Amino acid sequence: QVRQSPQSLTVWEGETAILNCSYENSAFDYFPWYQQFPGEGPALLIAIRSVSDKKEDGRFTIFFNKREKKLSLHITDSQPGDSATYFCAASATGANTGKLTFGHGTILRVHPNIQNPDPAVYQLRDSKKSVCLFTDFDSQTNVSQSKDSDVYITDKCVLDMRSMDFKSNSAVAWSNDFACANAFNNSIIPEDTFFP
Amino acid sequence: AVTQSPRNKVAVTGGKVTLSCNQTNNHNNMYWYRQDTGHGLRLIHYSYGAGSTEKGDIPDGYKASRPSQENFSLILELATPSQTSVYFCASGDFWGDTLYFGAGTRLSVLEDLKNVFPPEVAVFEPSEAEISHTQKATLVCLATGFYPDHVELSWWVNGKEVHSGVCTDPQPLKEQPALNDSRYALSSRLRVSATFWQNPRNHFRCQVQFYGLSENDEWTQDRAKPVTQIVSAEAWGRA
Amino acid sequence: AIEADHVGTYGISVYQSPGDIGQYTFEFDGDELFYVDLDKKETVWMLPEFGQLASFDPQGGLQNIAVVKHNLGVLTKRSNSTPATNEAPQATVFPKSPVLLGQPNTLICFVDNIFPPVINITWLRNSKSVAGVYETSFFVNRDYSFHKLSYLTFIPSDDDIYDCKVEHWGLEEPVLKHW
Amino acid sequence: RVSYYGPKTSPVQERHFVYQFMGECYFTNGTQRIRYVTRYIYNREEYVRYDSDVGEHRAVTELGRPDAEYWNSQPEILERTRAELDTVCRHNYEGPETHTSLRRLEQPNVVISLSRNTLVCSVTDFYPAKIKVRWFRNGQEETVGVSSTQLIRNGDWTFQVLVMLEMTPRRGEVYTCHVEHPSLKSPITVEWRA
């Protein structure tokens, strides 16, 4: 087996992500770390061999401990484009098998550093249902699902207008006697939020 | 590269499902994995070359086939709902150290086709308060009541697909997190400058690619067949 | 050749086409440690005790046979399809222990200079086909020919003679080896 | 347990066609001197080989030049083959062979019989192959008329040698067969009273 901790990690833009792996069978000598983006197949990110404890590739670094049978992938100065799953595989290459046995992967979410937030909740028009949009909040806050059913509170989202600036988070809530002042009452909204 | 086929498929229990994989890298080792949450990547079958197949960790239910150096095929002779998953093909060289995975195949095995619903798309125009508090305008798109989560959501501004100022939720949401056949919804956001939204010449468009039934199935209900189709909703600029 | 104390002959692969016939074996100091049954995809140990003392993942043999099949295709083309030369085999029969009436014994038939590695070795006691026999994997010789040994558990009685029947392509008609 | 690693057959870029490969590990003084040799044979004709005393794929015939030059060019192949002196030979010796082939000790079965005159001392079912067999007649080493067979490899990890003595049984004589072997704390003396 190959065991990866923690099952999912969340880091702020700039900090160092530390994804941990550990294997039982000491016949393992080749450890490739694969990376997978949503809607994509995984692709070899960075691989190490038991002979060398540390492999460096710019931002990425594998630390290998043959004694304790433990590995640690470090990503330094993480960009929000590192948000992805990281599988840690191992193989005893001497067996000439071709089988790789993968870990279950850890899920990396990299929070974008916001420099100027103005969190707010707006209401939008159906055109052509009632939807409430929660924008411009700092990445620190956590949007939690609705308390009761009939209400659909989606997860945070990162929007980047290329031309001017622009990083901004946003979550959408909608139902079908709901309104917007009470939409995210069941989440921790920052005390200085706008309700037009 | 390594292209699997088809990339989305819906099949009833008891039918035959042939997942094809082609690889143009002149590799010899080929693999059929599947991905499930909590269980990582689990190898189903693999083949060292033309004519031979090897049994992975989970050969039960599946039967490989390698008629060529390029082609490696999974076969599901009697589909089961437990085989509903995302299948991944790969290839490598002899003694290779890199695996070359394919794009992906979302496979839905279902007891009844009646739970296959296309989505309903509706664009929500931005609040005047956001325009008059930030000088920005966020349109929000909703694709609701579709099953299964085999959709792809894209924004089209003035006839060209945009990415700047776009974000879509990572995974859909269940409209009733209790029923096993609960349909899904997905929300996306496109933010443009206020002065861009206030030119009523500009039209913003929300396209939802829905992967469902095919022309070679049978539909036995009073409504339209939920084939693989585009569903879009549009909006224009204002004052 | 090279002089040494011990000689492990690790990873002996053979492939022959047409027919898709292979063989993957390990040897040590002349004796076979195991072979990888390519159809059962399993390591058959010569001595079971060894199989309980060590291990060999038969998949390594499978991939190595795949590689060798590949190399065989390429080298088949590259030599303008120069086919293989057949080799006249040479058979000798003798018993495991010295002959003795009614004493359970093994009648060994050792056939050498086998190429290509396709032989059909039949036992003929009272001029009638017999078979508790056991035959062994092909052992590689220094000249890259092969020798194969077919044993035969038997009880000697003065009544019936014995001959080894060898069928091979280097042989116009089969060849019989009396005893 | 311990595991047997094979060499990685490096890959190349009616009638019958035969291809063979083999990896030969030559040990002296344990692992104090290992020599590793991989051989690529097409139709009984060795055309490429890697000899660790050389350190590089050499062609043996004209068919081997493409593949030798190729396997030399790519370091992923070459340095891996070079390493297979430690990842195949040294590994297999220091591990699975130590637990199997190098641990096998089968004591020999010494049995004197009289064929008709000629005494036959049969030594059967032993491993490994080092063994000494000396006749005595009334306690004096006989080296005349003594004819031994070659070392016979039975094919089940057991050897067997037959040592015939020519003699003439005088009543009261005492012939002994003296057998030394590394699976024997003390040597074996089997006697035959005339």
DSSP class per residue in D146-169: EEEPPPEE-SSS-EEEEEEEE---
Is D3 touching A (CB cutoff 8 A)? yes
Q: Which of C55, C65, D81, B101 is nearest to A25 (CA)?
A: C55
Distance CA B84, CA B86 (A): 7
DSSP structure class, residue C135: B
Tokens 């890199």 correspond to what residue?
B98
Domain boundary among A112, A131, A162: A112
Residue A139 · residue A169 · CB < 8 Å: yes
Verify whether the Cβ–Cβ distance B94 to D11 is below 8 Å: yes
Best of C21, C64, C70, C74 to substitute, by most chain B Cβ atoms within 10 angstroms, is C70
Q: Collect all residues of chain A within an 8 Å Cβ-Cβ radius of residue D87.
A: 94
- Kindly provide the resolution of this structure in angstroms, with one decimal: 3.1
CATH number of the domain residue A57 falls in: 2.60.40.10
Residues A60 and A127 grouped into a single domain? no
Q: Which of D43, D41, D38, D35 is nearest to D6 (CA)?
A: D38
Chain A residue closest to B96 (CA)?
A98
**Which amino acid does the sequence have at B120?**
E
Distance CA A20, CA A105 (A): 10
Give the number of other CB atoms < 10 A from CB of residue A62: 25
Q: Which of C28, B186, C29 is nearest to A157 (CA)?
A: B186
The pairing of beta strand D188-193 with beta strand A70-75: unpaired
Best of A106, A135, A180 to substitute, by most chain B Cβ atoms within 10 angstroms, is A135
Q: Which backbone phi and psi does D92 adopt, to 5 degrees?
A: -65, -40
Residues A107 and A118 grouped into a single domain? no
Residues A84 and A161 grouped into a single domain? no
How many CB pairs below 8 A link B and D?
A: 7
Is D58 touching A (CB cutoff 8 A)? no
Residues A122 and A100 grouped into a single domain? no
Chain D nearest-CA distance from B164, in A, is 43
Is A95 touching C (CB cutoff 8 A)? yes
Facing residue for B164 by CB, picked from A40, A47, A163: A163
Distance CA B154, CA D29 (A): 71
The CA-atom distances, in angstroms, between D163 and each of A71, D143, D176 are 62, 11, 12
Verify whether the Cβ–Cβ distance B165 to A166 is below 8 Å: yes
Residue B140 · residue A126 · CB < 8 Å: no
**Which amino acid does the sequence have at A2?**
V
Verify whether the Cβ–Cβ distance D4 to C55 is below 8 Å: yes
Residues A9 and A97 grouped into a single domain? yes
Verify whether the Cβ–Cβ distance C63 to A96 is below 8 Å: yes
CATH number of the domain located at residue range(s) B112-239 in this protein: 2.60.40.10
Residues A177 and A145 grouped into a single domain? yes
The CA-atom distances, in angstroms, between C74 and each of A124, D11, D63, D67, D75 are 67, 10, 11, 11, 22
Q: CB-based burial of residue A85 (10 Å sphere; 0-12 exposed, 13-18 middle, 19+ buried)?
A: buried
How many CB pairs below 8 A link A and B?
A: 144
Chain A nearest-CA distance from C10, in A, is 13
Which structural technique was applied?
X-ray
- One-letter-per-residue 3-state SS of chain B: CEEEECCEEEEECCCCEEEEEEECCCCCEEEEEEEECCCEEEEEEEECCCCCCEECCCCCCEECCCCCCCECCEEECCCCHHHCEEEEEEEECCCCCCCECCCCEEEEEECCHHHCECCEEEEEECCHHHHHHHCEEEEEEEEEEEECCCEEEEEEECCEEECCCEEECCCCEECCCCCCCCCEEEEEEEEEEHHHHCCCCCEEEEEEEECCECCCCCCCCCCCCCECEEEEEEEECCC
Distance CA D106, CA D125 (A): 7
Give the residue numbers spanning the domain of A153: 113-195
Residue B40 · residue A104 · CB < 8 Å: yes
Which CATH entry fits the domain spanning B1-111: 2.60.40.10, 2.102.10.10, 3.40.50.12280, 3.40.50.1000?
Answer: 2.60.40.10
Q: How many domains does one find in chain A?
A: 2
**Which amino acid does the sequence have at C35?**
Y
Residue burial B63-85, b: 16+ Cβ < 10 Å; e: rest = ebbbeebbebbbbbeebeeebbb
Residue B164, strand partner residues: none
Where do the domains of chain C lie, and which CATH numbers do they carry? 4-83 (3.10.320.10), 84-179 (2.60.40.10)
Residue B156 · residue B139 · CB < 8 Å: no
Give the number of other CB atoms < 10 A from CB of residue A147: 10
Tokens 């086929």 correspond to what residue?
B5
Residue B179 · residue B158 · CB < 8 Å: no
User: Which regions of chain B carry the CATH code 2.60.40.10?
Assistant: 1-111, 112-239
The pairing of beta strand D56-59 with beta strand C90-95: unpaired
For chain C, how long is the longest CA-to-CA vector? Answer: 58
Q: Which of C112, B123, C117, D91 is nearest to A126 (CA)?
A: B123
Q: Is the peptide bond before C116 cis (omega within 30 degrees of 0)?
A: yes
Residue B54 · residue A99 · CB < 8 Å: no
Q: List residues of chain D with CB under 8 Å from any CB of chain B.
A: 8, 10-11, 76, 80
Chain D residue closest to C150 (CA)?
D155
The torsion of the CA quartet B18, B22, B28, B31, rounded to 10 degrees, works out to -50
Residues A105 and A174 grouped into a single domain? no
Residues A72 and A151 grouped into a single domain? no
Distance CA D181, CA B87 (A): 61
Chain B residue closest to C58 (CA)?
B54
Q: What are the residues whose beta carbons fall under 8 Å from the beta carbon of D193, sequence distance 6 or more?
A: D173, D174
